[PDB]
């Protein structure tokens, strides 16, 4: 109800997350097992730090 969650708390509900909820929170699919560059120390695209 309040994703910013700033000072208006009436309840706090837990529940199972369906697969339609997991691809609704997400901002994109990580598809490579890469973290960061080895030379330029910048995060690689489509990796765990992209």
């Amino acid at each position: 109800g309040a994703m910013l969650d700033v000072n208006f708390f009436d309840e706090l509900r837990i529940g199972l997350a369906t697969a339609e909820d997991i691809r609704q929170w997400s901002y994109g699919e990580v598809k490579k097992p890469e973290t960061i560059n080895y030379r330029t120390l910048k995060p690689e695209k489509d990796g765990l730090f992209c």
Binding site: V30, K31, K32, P33, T35, L48
Partner: protein, 49 residues
């Protein structure tokens, strides 16, 4: 753990498109299951990573 999950997932996605016998695909799916189980709660089923 995230790297191992996405590694075995990419290898399963390659083995399925390449065409493979059932033993290799079943071994890959069991490895994927064990990787996600190691991510969520380590050391519960089997020996810990």
């Amino acid at each position: 753990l995230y790297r191992r999950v996405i590694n075995r997932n990419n290898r399963l996605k390659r083995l399925i498109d390449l065409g493979a016998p059932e033993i290799i695909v079943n071994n890959e799916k069991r490895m994927l299951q064990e990787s996600v189980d190691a991510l969520f709660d380590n050391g519960r089923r089997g020996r810990p990573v």
